[PDB]
Amino acid sequence: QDPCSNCPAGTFCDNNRNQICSPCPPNSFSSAGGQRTCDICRQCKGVFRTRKECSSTSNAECDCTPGFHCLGAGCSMCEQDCKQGQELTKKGCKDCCFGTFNDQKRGICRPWTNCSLDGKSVLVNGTKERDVVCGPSPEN
Amino acid sequence: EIVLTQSPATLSLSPGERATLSCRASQSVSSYLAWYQQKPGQAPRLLIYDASNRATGIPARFSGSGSGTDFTLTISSLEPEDFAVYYCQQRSNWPPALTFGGGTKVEIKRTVAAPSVFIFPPSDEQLKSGTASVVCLLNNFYPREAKVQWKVDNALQSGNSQESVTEQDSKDSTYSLSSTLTLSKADYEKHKVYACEVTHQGLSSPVTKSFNRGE
Amino acid sequence: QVQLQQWGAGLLKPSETLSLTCAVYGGSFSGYYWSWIRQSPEKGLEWIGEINHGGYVTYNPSLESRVTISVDTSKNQFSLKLSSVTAADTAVYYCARDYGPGNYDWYFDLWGRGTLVTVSSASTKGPSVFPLAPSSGTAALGCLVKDYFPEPVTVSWNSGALTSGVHTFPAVLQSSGLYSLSSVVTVPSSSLGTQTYICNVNHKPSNTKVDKKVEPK
Ligand SMILES: *[C@@H]1O[C@H](CO[C@@H]2O[C@@H](C)[C@@H](O)[C@@H](O)[C@@H]2O)[C@@H](O[C@@H]2O[C@H](CO)[C@@H](O[C@@H]3O[C@H](CO)[C@@H](O)[C@H](O)[C@@H]3O)[C@H](O)[C@H]2NC(C)=O)[C@H](O[C@@H]2O[C@@H](C)[C@@H](O)[C@@H](O)[C@@H]2O)[C@H]1NC(C)=O
């Protein structure tokens, strides 16, 4: 068989010391069992900020500095924050044109829901920061 | 650590019979277990590794089985070369541990043989030194178990005797035992009869052998 | 045809340092782990630790605080050092090569011959040899070698002549730190005044040889 399967997360199977399971050195982790070398903790500096500090079992988790929002999977790239009611596009960030909105500091502007198409009234008209909330369907 | 316990402590079997030895682990060790044979005055020799595989020079009658916490070593048909002590050994990386068992002696089964008892009075030379050594000998008996107690003027002696026993003899498979009572010359001369009484399975009743300090 | 030779000090006082060395002859040294294992009559077989060509070490935890294992890759030699020894450390120390079939080297396939190491505060002394005289159809007599340190001591009967009925008993360490054993032999009661019986006792550590004649009382 192969006894490195026995080694839990937080340790590695040391091929120099006859497959004993020693814990992970400083600034290092192993997220699964069986690993022959521990992995280096990601360090969050500059554009990023440490959210969850790294353990022996788990990597570090990086936020983005205030005014910025994590772009990719795992907060890899880092994009800037427009305010509510705006959309950052090409050439900077601009307010949403009338009839559009954005409820977050992220993303594009979507057009308002059109209530008239389901026979519905408009209970509260939309702004640039919130959508129209539609009234009761005329099937009631 | 993880502790391996072998049983029985010793095993008495006649040649050609089948030996079955056991090893119990205190927690699981999967199959990372080995058996060794050790003959007197030699290093241990690897027989079985990975619970069930023979090592290079090992004959076919040796066989191992088991996984987890209970392992058995089987010798299919005992031969003269095979009467030795057998140890088991385990290794673990989580948690890290390397340990052996306490051993199982495999001993040649014989018919019971009562001892031949002899008492020996202290040498006159030694009594000049200021100490006396009385010596009881049990010769060529089987099984190894034997009660030997000293009676000095009918009083029973406690913490002044030391026993000592040979290895099973090469030819007739018996043991020999030697009890040595040691008193100071002063304490030795306060008493007359120095008796050694021997209880053993081979004897219909205990045998006493004594002497008087005068003669 | 690989083989291990070991050597080193065999008699130490308490607080001193056990030192031993193993040499590998006839094979490579790099592909293997090399172990030190000791065997006690009290505490049995006990693994001390292991090293490889790279000087990577694992130790038994019960000993790590006083153990050192080191390697000399220029002579294919590894060596054991055990500090602050105590009577408990008296044992036969073995060197051995680890073996395993898979990706682990977790058993022991090849062993040194063993080196017995004794620790004791007793200073070296020679045996007093006293006789165990017979009486009056089998008789029994013998020699009592007493109060000697250290082991070993040899005991022959009739300068090697008489061997048949002999039992030499294992030495036993008394409370003084000195060993004692007795040798005995069964002889026919007929031959008691005829044939003459002499035990020859050799204790090389003190350069003491003694031949004592056992005559009936
Ligand atoms: C909700 O929005 C209304 C207009 O939006 C339309 O309706 C909603 C429901 C949705 O369907 C959208 O798609 C539509 O665009 C607001 O009503 C509008 O109010 C303005 C003034 O606030 C009025 O504009 C002009 O005002 C000048 C004054 O100088 C006058 O001369 C013009 O004639 C004209 O009145 C728009 O005409 C009017 N639109 C409609 C369709 O009525 C509404 O505001 C509120 O409701 C109206 C009826 C008035 O009572 C206002 O005072 C009041 O603010 C929005 N709702 C809220 C709560 O603000």
Numbering used by the authors:
A (entry chain F): 25 to 164
B (entry chain E): 1 to 215
C (entry chain D): 1 to 136, 142 to 222
What did the authors write?
The 4-1BB binding partner, 4-1BBL, is a type II membrane protein of the TNF superfamily. The two leading molecules in the clinic are utomilumab (PF-05082566) and urelumab (BMS-663513). Consequently, we solved a series of structures that help us understand the structure–function relationship of the 4-1BB/4-1BBL signaling complex and how therapeutic antibodies could perturb this system.
Structures of 4-1BB/utomilumab Fab and 4-1BB/urelumab Fab complexes were determined by molecular replacement and refined to resolutions of 2.72 and 2.8 Å, respectively. In contrast, urelumab binds to the very N-terminus of the 4-1BB receptor on CRD-1. Unlike utomilumab, urelumab binding to 4-1BB does not appear to interfere with receptor engagement of the ligand. Instead urelumab binds independently of 4-1BBL with the bulk of the Fab facing away from the center axis of the receptor–ligand complex. Cross-linking 4-1BB through the bivalent binding of the IgG, the orientation of urelumab on CRD-1 allows for the possibility of cross-linking multiple 4-1BB/4-1BBL complexes, further augmenting its agonist properties. The urelumab binding site on 4-1BB orients the antibody such that the Fc domain would be optimally exposed for interaction with FcγR, potentially enhancing what limited ADCC that could occur. Here, using confocal microscopy on our 4-1BB-transduced Jurkat cell line we demonstrated that urelumab can, indeed, drive ligand-induced clustering on cells while utomilumab does not, and that utomilumab can moderate urelumab’s clustering ability presumably by blocking binding of 4-1BB receptor to its ligand and limiting the formation of higher order structures. Bivalent binding of urelumab is required, not just interaction with CRD-1, as the urelumab Fab does not cluster receptor–ligand complex.
